[PDB]
């Protein structure tokens, strides 16, 4: 590990500087180094890890979608044959994206999840596992596609089961998990009715628990509730 000689605290500090500088690849490399120190991550550290890799993979996904659309146009009837280049470059971006996902999943399996006992850590990491298998599923076409989808589903479902037993319905981790699992159902599993049902039930159960919250907690929860409503509006 290129970060093996850097102090854990210095890696965390530099991840925060990289965030301020919008250097998300650096941020992710610093947080990977911090994870590889072997200690559990605090709440703030878990979110630094997720912010970093979400920005990296998000850029890769956006680029993959542009290239995939170009490739699809180049393959329809009447199109001029442009050679192997579009496929090759889409494949390059896809392989890099898969590499990022494999790296995140590797950190979760070695050994973040197995040491995560509190709901706020374990649900967060299982949500991340579902998310990164979902990103793999977005680009998957081979013999293992169904297994990739099922790996995402299984991780999301374990996270859901814990979240329902161990967190209030307004907990922002629980809400974001449900939001993302709902998108998994809609976009990956071809289950739009399950997606809509999950978003609606999550929103309504959160609404009913808002009365228990402080002003700051209310803001955190209602922000994600609005994303649930935004998706419901898109889908109905």
């Amino acid at each position: 590990g290129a970060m093996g000689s850097m102090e854990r605290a210095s890696l965390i500090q530099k991840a925060k500087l990289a965030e301020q500088a919008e250097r998300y690849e650096d941020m992710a490399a610093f947080m990977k180094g911090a994870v590889e120190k072997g200690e559990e991550l605090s709440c703030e550290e878990r979110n630094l890890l997720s912010v970093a890799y979400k920005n990296v993979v998000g850029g890769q996904r956006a680029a993959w979608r542009v290239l995939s659309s170009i490739e699809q146009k180049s393959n329809e009837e009447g199109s001029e044959e442009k050679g192997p280049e579009v496929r090759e470059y889409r494949e390059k971006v896809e392989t890099e994206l898969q590499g990022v996902c494999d790296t995140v999943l590797g950190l979760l399996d070695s050994h973040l999840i197995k040491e995560a006992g509190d709901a706020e850590s374990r649900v967060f990491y299982l949500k991340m596992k579902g998310d990164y298998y979902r990103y793999l599923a977005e680009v998957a076409t081979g013999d293992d596609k169904k297994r990739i989808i099922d790996s995402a589903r299984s991780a999301y479902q374990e996270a859901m089961d814990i979240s329902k037993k161990e967190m209030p319905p307004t907990n922002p981790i629980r809400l974001g998990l449900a939001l993302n699992f709902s998108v998994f159902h809609y976009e990956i599993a071809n289950s739009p009715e399950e997606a809509i049902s999950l978003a609606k039930t999550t929103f309504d159960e959160a609404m009913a628990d808002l009365h228990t919250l402080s002003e700051d907690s209310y803001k955190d929860s209602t922000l994600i509730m609005q994303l649930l409503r935004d998706n419901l509006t898109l889908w109905t």
Binding site: D131, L179, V183, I224, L234
Partner: peptide, 5 residues
């Protein structure tokens, strides 16, 4: 695309 966090 739909919203995720």
């Amino acid at each position: 695309f739909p919203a995720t966090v």
